[model samples]
Target chain A: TMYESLKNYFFEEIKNDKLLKLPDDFYDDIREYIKNIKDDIELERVKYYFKELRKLRIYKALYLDNERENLLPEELNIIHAIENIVVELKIE
Target chain B: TMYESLKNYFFEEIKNDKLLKLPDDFYDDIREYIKNIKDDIELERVKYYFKELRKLRIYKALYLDNERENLLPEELNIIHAIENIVVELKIE
Candidate 1:
């Protein structure tokens, strides 16, 4: 299954990076896997995995000078959205 | 600030529920606060709170026989999305 395969790939990548490093096609592969998904449980599992990956990637980009510019468009959009929300809140 | 106020409210609510129980207006209040957000850090803080709240709520709904039907439309949408993804994956 793609999930198990990807899980293994992710494990190896994490081990190698000792931090967080994803191949350029990682998100693309996920999108492809998601397109042919088959059940709610598996979907949740995939989402959970992706969410964790994105979180670690974001952490690395934010604190490790890991080149935010290198992030995918989707990630950049998330960052932009967060910035927008922050601007709007304008804490009292 | 709304963040501090909401933080306190959440603390009290969590303490009282001893599990996870959010007032009906909780999401609304969060949306309102988000609408006026002021900075990236604050936005991230609010996003973190909401994410944690949602995760706990999902856990309760999934394992505690809590009424999933009572969940907000946004939550329902999330559940539906997860289900759809699972179906698409159709684990092997």
Candidate 2:
């Protein structure tokens, strides 16, 4: 799926100089990763990346899993997921 | 709230040729109306209009009630609300 590319891109983009161009399958991978993964933190990252991907793939035939935009409801779940993951990832 | 303006816009836009511009308080009204109203159908319409408004207000400092986008979770509630309202509104 595109997650590997996106996941790799995210890690690299943080350090790399230039913006990574999203692939054609970016949106598809965004949808696919969420379907296969069960972890909430991963899904939280996925949603964030998907939105990021959408911004990058403005010209592509993007397939959103939904019609809502800009902090649509799932964001609450992401916020919750983020909190859960952050707590889990926190150093003791 | 923005619902009255939005509700009015939706009604008028359906018939009027030119698109009606949204007010500054559009998103505020969206949050406000959802808070005040208990009716599912109206919420359904509100959700739909809010999405449309977000699209139109792309330049303004829009405040989303959430952090997710593209059918985030609440859309499911909206979907549920729409179904319940449809059943209730259906002619016997």
Over 4 Å off, model 1: A1-4, A13-19, A33-92, B1-4, B13-19, B33-92
What lDDT tens digits, residue by residue, belong to model 2 across residues B24-46? 54444456556677878776766
Model 2 clash pairs? A71-B68, A72-B68, A73-B73, A74-B72, A74-B73, A75-B68, B2-B29
- C-alpha RMSD for every candidate: 8.3, 17.2
Per-residue error (Å), model 2, residue B58: 2.6
**B1-92, model 1: which lDDT tens digit per residue?**
66576577556645543344456866777788676667988877777766545554444443453466556665555444432323234366
Docking level of model 2: incorrect
Chain A TM-score of each model, in the order shown?
Answer: 0.59, 0.38
Worst 10 residues of 2 chain A by lDDT: A81-90
Please provide, for model 2 over A1-92, each residue's C-alpha lDDT reduced to its tens digit, 9 standing for 90 to 100: 44455666556545533344444544444555555678876666655555453332221111222322333243333323312211112244
The most accurate candidate by TM-score is 1
Docking class of 1: incorrect
